[PDB]
Amino acid sequence: DDAIDIQVIEADGTQADYPVGPGQPLIISDGETVDAGQALTDGPANPH
């Protein structure tokens, strides 16, 4: 069904299940070196 979920495996093996959602949030993330705060689906970040 093209859920397009970004599942990340922690240092222990814990998933996150980030849903991309609609088509407007275009994906740009294939780094495989992500760190906290890194954006995945393009656009202006929410600072709060």
Side-chain angles (χ1 to χ4, degrees), residues 7-16 18 34:
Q7 171 261 101
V8 309
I9 336 169
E10 279 234 32
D12 81 315
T14 306
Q15 79 280 42
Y18 301 135
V34 283

Side-chain angles (χ1 to χ4, degrees), residues 17-41:
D17 222 292
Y18 301 135
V20 159
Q24 303 53 28
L26 328 166
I27 196 88
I28 58 198
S29 100
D30 198 24
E32 324 288 290
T33 36
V34 283
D35 197 287
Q38 186 146 13
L40 309 171
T41 90

